[PDB]
mmCIF file of C-alpha atoms in Angstrom:
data_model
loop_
_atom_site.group_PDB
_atom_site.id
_atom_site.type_symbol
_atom_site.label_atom_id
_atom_site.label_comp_id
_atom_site.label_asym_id
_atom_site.label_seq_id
_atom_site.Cartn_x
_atom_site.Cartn_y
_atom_site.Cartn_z
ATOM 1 C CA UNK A 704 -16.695 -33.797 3.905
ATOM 2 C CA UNK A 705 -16.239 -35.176 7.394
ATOM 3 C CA UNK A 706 -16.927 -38.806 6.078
ATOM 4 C CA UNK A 707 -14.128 -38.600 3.816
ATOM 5 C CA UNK A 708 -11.841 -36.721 6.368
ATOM 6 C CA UNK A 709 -12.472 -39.310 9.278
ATOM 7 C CA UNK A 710 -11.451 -42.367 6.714
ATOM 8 C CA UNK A 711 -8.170 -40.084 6.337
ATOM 9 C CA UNK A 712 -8.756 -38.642 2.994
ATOM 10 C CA UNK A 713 -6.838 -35.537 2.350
ATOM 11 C CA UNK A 714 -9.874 -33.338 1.262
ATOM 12 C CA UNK A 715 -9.731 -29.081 -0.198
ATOM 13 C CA UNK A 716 -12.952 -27.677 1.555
ATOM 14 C CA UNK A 717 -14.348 -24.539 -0.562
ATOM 15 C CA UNK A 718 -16.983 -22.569 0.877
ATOM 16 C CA UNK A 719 -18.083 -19.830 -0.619
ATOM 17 C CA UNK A 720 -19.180 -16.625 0.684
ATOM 18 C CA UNK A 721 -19.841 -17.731 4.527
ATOM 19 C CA UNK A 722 -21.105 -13.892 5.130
ATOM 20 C CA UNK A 723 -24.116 -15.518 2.793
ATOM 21 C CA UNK A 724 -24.669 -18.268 5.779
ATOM 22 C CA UNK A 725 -24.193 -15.189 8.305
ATOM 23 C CA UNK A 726 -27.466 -13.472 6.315
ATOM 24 C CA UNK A 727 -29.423 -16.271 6.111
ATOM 25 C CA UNK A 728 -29.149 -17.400 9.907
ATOM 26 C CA UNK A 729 -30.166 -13.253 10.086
ATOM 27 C CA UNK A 730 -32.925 -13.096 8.042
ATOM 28 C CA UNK A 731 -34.114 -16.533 9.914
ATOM 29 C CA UNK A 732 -33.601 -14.921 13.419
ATOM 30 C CA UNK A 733 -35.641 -11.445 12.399
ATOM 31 C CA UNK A 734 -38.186 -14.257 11.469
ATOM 32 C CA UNK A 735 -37.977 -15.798 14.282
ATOM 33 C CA UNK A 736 -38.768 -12.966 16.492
ATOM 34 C CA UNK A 737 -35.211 -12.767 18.343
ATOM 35 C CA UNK A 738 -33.776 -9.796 19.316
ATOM 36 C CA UNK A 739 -31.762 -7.972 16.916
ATOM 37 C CA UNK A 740 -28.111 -7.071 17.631
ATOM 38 C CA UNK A 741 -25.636 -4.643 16.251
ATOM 39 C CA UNK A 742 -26.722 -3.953 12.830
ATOM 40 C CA UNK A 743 -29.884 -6.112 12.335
ATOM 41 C CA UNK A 744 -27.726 -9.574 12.952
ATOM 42 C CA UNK A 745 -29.094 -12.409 15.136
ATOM 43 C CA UNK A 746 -27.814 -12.269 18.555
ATOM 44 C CA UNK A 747 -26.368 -15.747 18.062
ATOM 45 C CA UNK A 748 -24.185 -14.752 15.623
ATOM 46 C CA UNK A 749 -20.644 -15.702 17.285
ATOM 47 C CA UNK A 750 -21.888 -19.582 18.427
ATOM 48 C CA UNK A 751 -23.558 -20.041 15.115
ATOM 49 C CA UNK A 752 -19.979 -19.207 13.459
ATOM 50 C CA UNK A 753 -18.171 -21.462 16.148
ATOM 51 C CA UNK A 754 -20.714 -24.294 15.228
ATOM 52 C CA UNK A 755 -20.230 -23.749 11.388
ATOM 53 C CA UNK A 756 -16.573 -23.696 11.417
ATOM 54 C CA UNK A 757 -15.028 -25.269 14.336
ATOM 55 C CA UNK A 758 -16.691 -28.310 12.060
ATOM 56 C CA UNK A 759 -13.630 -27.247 9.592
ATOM 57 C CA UNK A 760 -10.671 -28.717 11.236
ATOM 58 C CA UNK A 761 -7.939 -31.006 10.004
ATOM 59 C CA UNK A 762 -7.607 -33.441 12.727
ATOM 60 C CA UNK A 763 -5.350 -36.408 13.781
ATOM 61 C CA UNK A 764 -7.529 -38.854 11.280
ATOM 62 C CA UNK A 765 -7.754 -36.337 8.223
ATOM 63 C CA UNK A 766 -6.860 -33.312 6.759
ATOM 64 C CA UNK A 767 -9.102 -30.852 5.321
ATOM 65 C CA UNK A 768 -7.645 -27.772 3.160
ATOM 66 C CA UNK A 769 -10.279 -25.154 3.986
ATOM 67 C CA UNK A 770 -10.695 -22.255 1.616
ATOM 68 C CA UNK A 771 -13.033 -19.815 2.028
ATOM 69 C CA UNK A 772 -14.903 -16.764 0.908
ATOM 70 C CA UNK A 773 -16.358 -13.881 2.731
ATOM 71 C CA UNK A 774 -18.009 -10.969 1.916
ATOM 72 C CA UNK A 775 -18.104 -7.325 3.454
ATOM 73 C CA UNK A 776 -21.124 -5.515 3.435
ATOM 74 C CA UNK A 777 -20.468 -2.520 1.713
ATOM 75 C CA UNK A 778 -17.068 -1.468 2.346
ATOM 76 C CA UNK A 779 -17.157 -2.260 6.110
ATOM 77 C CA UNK A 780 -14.594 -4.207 7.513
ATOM 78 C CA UNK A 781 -16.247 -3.399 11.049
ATOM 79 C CA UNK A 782 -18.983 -5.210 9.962
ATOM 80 C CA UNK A 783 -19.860 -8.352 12.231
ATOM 81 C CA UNK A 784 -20.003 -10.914 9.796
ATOM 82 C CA UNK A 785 -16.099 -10.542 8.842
ATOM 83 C CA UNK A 786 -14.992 -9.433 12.092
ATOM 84 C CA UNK A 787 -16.691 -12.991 13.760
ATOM 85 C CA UNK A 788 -14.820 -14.489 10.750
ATOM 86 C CA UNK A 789 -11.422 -13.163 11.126
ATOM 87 C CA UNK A 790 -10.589 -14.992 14.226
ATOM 88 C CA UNK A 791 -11.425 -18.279 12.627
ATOM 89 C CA UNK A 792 -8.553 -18.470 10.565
ATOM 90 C CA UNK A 793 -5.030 -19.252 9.576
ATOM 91 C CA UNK A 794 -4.386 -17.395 6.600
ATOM 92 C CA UNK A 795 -6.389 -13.902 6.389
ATOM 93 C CA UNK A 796 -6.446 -12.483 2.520
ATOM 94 C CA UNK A 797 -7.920 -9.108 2.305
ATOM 95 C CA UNK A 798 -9.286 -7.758 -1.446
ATOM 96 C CA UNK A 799 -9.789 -3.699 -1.200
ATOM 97 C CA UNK A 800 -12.051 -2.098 -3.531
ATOM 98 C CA UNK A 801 -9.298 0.533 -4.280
ATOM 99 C CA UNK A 802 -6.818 -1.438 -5.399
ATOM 100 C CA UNK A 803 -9.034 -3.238 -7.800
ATOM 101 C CA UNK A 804 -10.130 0.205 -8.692
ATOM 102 C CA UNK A 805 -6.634 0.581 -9.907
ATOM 103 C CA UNK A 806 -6.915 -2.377 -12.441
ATOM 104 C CA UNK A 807 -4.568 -4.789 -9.727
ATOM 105 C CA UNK A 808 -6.897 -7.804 -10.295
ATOM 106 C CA UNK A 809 -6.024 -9.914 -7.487
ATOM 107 C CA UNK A 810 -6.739 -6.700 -5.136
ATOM 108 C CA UNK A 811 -4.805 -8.268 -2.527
ATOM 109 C CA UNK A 812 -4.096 -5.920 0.312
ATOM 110 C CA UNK A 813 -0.641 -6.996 1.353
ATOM 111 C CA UNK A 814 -0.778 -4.869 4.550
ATOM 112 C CA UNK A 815 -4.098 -6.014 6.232
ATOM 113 C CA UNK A 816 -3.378 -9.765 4.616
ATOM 114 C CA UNK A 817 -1.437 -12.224 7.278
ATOM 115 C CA UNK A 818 -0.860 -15.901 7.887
ATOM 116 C CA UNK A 819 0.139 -18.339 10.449
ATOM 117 C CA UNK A 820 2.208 -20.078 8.179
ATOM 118 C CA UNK A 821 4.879 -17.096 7.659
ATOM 119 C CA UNK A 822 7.274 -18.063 9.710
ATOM 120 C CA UNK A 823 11.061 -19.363 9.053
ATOM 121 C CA UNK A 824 10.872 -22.222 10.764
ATOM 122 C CA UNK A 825 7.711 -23.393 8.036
ATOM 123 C CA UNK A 826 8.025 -21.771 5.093
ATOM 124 C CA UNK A 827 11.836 -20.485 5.030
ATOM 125 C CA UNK A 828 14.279 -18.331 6.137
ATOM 126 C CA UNK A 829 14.247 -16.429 2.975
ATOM 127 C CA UNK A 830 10.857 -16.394 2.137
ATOM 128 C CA UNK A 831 9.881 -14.928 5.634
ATOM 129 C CA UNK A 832 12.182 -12.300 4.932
ATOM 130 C CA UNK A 833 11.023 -11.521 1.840
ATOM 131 C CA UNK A 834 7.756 -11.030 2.853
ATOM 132 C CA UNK A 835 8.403 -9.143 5.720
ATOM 133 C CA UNK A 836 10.364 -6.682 3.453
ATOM 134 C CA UNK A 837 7.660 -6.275 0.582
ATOM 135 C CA UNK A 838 5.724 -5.152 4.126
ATOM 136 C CA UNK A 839 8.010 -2.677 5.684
ATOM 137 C CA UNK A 840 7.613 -1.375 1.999
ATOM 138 C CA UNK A 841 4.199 -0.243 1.267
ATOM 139 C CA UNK A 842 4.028 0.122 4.848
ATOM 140 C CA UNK A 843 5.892 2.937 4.436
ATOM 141 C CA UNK A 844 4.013 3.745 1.466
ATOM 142 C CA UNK A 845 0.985 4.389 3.736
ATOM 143 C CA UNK A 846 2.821 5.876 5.700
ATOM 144 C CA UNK A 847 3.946 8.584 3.136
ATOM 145 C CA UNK A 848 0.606 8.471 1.498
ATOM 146 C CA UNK A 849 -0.500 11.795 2.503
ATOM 147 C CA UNK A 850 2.492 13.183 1.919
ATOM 148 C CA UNK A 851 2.625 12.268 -1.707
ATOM 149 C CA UNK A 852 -0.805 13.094 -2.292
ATOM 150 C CA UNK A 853 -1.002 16.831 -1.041
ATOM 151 C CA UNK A 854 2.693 17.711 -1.849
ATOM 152 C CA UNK A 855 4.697 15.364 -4.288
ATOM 153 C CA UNK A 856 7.304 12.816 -4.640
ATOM 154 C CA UNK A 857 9.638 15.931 -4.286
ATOM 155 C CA UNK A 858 9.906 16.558 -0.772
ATOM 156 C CA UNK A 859 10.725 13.107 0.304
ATOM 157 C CA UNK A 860 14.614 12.335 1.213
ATOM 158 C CA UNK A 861 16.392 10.190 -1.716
ATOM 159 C CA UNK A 862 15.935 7.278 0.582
ATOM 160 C CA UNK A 863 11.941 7.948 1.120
ATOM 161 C CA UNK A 864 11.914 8.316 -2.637
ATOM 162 C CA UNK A 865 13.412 4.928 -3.310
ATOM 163 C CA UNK A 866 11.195 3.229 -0.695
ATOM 164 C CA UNK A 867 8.364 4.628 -2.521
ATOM 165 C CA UNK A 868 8.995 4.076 -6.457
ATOM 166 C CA UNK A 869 10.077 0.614 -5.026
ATOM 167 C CA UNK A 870 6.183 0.423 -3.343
ATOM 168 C CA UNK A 871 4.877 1.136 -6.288
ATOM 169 C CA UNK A 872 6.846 -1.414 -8.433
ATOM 170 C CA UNK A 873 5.923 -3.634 -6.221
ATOM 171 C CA UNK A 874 2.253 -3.279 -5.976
ATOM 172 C CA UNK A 875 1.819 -3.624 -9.767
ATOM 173 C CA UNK A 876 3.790 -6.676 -9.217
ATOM 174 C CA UNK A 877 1.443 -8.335 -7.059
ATOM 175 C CA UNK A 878 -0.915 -8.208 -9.855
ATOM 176 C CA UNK A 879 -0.743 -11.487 -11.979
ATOM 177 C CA UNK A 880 -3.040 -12.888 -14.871
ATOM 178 C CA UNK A 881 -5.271 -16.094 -14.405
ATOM 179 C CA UNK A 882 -6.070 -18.612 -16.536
ATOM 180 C CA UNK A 883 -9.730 -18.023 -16.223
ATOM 181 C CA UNK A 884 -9.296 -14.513 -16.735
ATOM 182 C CA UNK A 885 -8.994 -14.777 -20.560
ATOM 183 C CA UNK A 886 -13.061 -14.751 -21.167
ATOM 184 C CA UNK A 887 -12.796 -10.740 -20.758
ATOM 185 C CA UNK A 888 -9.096 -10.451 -20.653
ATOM 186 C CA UNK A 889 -6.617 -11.480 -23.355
ATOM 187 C CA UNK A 890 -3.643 -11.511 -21.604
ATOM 188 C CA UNK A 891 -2.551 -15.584 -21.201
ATOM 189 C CA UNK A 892 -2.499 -17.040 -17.428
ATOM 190 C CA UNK A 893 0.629 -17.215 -15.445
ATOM 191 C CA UNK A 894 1.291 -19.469 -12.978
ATOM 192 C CA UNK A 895 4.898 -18.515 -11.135
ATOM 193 C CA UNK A 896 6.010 -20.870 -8.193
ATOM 194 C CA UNK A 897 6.430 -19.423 -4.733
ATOM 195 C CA UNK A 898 10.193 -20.179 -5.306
ATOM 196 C CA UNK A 899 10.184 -17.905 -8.239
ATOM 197 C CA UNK A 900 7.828 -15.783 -6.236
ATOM 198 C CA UNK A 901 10.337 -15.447 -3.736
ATOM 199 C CA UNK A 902 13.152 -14.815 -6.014
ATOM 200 C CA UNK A 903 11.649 -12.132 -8.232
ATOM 201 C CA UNK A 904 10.884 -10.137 -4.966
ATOM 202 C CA UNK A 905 14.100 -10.652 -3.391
ATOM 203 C CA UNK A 906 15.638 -9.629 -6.797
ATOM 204 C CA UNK A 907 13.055 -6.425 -6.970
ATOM 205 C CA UNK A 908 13.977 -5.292 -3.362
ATOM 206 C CA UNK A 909 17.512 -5.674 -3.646
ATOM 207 C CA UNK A 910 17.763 -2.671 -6.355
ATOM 208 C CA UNK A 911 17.228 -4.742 -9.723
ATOM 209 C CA UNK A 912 14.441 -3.738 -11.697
ATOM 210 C CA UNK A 913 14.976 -0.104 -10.719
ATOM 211 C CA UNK A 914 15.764 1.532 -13.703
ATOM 212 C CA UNK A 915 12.583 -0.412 -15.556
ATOM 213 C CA UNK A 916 9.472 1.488 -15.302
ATOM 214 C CA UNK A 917 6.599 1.010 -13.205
ATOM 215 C CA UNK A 918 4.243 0.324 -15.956
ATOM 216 C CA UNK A 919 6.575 -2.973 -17.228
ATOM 217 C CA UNK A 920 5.156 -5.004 -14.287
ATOM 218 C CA UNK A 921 1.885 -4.887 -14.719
ATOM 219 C CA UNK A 922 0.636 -8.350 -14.998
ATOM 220 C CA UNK A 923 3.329 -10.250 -15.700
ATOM 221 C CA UNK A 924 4.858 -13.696 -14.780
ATOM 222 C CA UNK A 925 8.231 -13.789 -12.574
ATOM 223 C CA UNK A 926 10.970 -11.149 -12.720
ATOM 224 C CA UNK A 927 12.521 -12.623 -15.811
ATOM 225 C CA UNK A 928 9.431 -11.974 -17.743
ATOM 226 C CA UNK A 929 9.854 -8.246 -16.681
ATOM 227 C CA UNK A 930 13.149 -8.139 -18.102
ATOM 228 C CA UNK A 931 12.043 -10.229 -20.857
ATOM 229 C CA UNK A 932 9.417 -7.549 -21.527
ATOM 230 C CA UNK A 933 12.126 -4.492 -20.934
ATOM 231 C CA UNK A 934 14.433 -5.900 -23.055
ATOM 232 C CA UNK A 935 11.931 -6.434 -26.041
ATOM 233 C CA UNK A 936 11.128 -2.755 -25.499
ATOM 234 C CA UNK A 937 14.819 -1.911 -24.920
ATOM 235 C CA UNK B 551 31.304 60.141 -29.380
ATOM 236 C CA UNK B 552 27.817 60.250 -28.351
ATOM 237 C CA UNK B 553 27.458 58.289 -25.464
ATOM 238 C CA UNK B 554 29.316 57.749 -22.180
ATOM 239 C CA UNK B 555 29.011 54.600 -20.609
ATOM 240 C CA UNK B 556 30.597 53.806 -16.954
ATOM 241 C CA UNK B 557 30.365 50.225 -15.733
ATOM 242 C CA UNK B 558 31.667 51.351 -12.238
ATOM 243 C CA UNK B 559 31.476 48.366 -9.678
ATOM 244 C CA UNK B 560 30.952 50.229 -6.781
ATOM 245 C CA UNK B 561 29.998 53.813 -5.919
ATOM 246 C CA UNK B 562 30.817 55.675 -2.491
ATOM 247 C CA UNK B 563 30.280 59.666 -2.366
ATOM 248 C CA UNK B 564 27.896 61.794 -3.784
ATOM 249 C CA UNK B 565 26.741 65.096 -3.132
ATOM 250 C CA UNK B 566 22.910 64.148 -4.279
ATOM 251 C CA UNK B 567 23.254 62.153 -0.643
ATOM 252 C CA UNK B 568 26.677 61.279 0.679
ATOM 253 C CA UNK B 569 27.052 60.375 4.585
ATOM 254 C CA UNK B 570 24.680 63.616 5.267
ATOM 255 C CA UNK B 571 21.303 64.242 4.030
ATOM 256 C CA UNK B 572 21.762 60.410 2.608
ATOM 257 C CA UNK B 573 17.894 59.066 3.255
ATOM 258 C CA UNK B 574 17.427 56.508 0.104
ATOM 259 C CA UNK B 575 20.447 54.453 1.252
ATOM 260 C CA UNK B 576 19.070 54.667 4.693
ATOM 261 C CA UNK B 577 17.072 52.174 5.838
ATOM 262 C CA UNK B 578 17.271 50.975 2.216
ATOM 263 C CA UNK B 579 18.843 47.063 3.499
ATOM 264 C CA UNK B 580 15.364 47.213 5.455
ATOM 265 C CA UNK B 581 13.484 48.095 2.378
ATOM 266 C CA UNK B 582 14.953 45.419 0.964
ATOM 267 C CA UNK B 583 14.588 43.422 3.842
ATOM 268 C CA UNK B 584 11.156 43.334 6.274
ATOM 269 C CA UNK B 585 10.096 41.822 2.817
ATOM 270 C CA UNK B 586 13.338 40.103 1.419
ATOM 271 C CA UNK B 587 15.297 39.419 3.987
ATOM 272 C CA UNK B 588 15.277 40.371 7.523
ATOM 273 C CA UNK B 589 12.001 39.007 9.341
ATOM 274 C CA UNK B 590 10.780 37.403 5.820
ATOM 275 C CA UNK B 591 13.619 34.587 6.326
ATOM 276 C CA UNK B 592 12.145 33.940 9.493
ATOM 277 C CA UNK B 593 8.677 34.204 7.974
ATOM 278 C CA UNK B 594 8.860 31.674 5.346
ATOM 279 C CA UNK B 595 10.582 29.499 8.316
ATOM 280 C CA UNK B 596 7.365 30.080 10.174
ATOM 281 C CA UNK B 597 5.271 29.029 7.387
ATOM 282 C CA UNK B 598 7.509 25.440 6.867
ATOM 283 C CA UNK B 599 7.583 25.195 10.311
ATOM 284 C CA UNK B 600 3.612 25.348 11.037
ATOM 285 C CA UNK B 601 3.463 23.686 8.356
ATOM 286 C CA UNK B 602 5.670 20.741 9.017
ATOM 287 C CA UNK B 603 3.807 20.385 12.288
ATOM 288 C CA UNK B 604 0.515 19.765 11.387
ATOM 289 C CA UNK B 605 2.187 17.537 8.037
ATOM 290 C CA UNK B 606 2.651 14.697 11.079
ATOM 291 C CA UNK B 607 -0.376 15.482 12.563
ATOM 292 C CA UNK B 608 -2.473 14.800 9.890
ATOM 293 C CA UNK B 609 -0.869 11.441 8.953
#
């Protein structure tokens, strides 16, 4: 790829699974008789990441769209495969096995997911504040996590309740179908600009949508597919 | 004819206790009370307030 990026080629760089690189240069070093650090990995873990991708940088000749994958051992987000990762990055997208669990195909964890990018100067004024609301919610979700769990929505103030039913809308929301999803599931793919995007959440946090059901925005399109959807159920 | 039925809303003397010798009426608030009222209002307040404590402290 660095031919094509040094002749000024725009180029979209997907690796996949670099935490598979990580294991290999692991299993080589326990070969190789090195000593082990942390949990079994090589000891030249962090310079063998820096080699690998410092190599994948967009530079004044070319520009190269990196996309990656990485996988956690386990569960473990401590692990030292990710963590080296994580500060290689511009835009960090985290999948959690519970919310996956809970049927939310993309699994995207919008709390411990970030970017450069989001700022108002870059991507808008009202798209940064979108986002930064759909945080503040769900943020207080898990805050109030706990709270629902052991005692109910109940004892939360009217406020506290709204914040929460809205958290909830709004992570079945996030889920969304794919076009190669339809080999095991039949619902068609959706593909909803970030404009839209942006809209539908702006639409959802303002206090529209509130009297439609959680369960209506389950993998659906924009917001006017959820009314769409509403209204064909009345 | 056969039955007597007074819906009095309130009753003062009577000889079975009146102000003297009265005991059921005495401390009978209390009765009513240690458990009902007095000290159990501040009980259950305990019991939210312990409560609401550690609700914090475990988030």
């Amino acid at each position: 790829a660095e031919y094509f990026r040094d002749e000024g080629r725009d180029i979209l760089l997907f690796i996949d699974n670099i935490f598979r690189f990580v294991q290999a240069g692991s299993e080589v070093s326990s070969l190789l008789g090195r000593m082990p650090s942390q949990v079994g990995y090589q000891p030249t873990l962090g310079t063998e990441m820096g080699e690998l991708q410092e190599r994948i940088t967009s530079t004044k000749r070319g520009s190269i769209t990196s996309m990656q994958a990485v996988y956690v051992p386990a569960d473990d987000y401590t692990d030292p495969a990710p963590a080296t990762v994580f500060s290689h990055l511009d835009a960090t997208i985290s999948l959690e096995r519970s919310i996956a669990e809970r049927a939310i195909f993309p699994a995207v964890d919008p709390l411990a997911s970030t970017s450069r990018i989001l700022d108002p100067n870059i991507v808008g004024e009202e798209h940064y504040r979108v986002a930064q609301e759909v945080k503040r919610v769900l943020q207080r979700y898990k805050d109030l996590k706990d709270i629902i769990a052991i005692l109910g929505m109940e004892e939360l103030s009217d406020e506290d309740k709204l914040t929460v039913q809205r958290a909830r809308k709004i992570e079945l929301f996030f889920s969304q179908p794919f076009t190669v999803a339809q080999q095991f599931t039949g619902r068609p793919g959706k593909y909803v600009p970030v404009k839209k995007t942006v809209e539908s959440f702006a639409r959802l946090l303002n206090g529209e949508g509130d009297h439609i059901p959680e369960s209506f925005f389950y993998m659906q399109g924009d917001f006017d597919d959820v009314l769409a959807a509403y209204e064909a159920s009345q | 004819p056969h039955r007597v039925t007074i819906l009095a809303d309130t009753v003062e003397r009577a000889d079975e206790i009146d102000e003297a010798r009265a005991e059921q009426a005495r401390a009978e608030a209390e009765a009513r009370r240690r458990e009902a009222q007095s000290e159990r209002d501040m009980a259950l307040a305990e019991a939210k307030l312990r409560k609401e404590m550690v609700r914090l402290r475990v988030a």
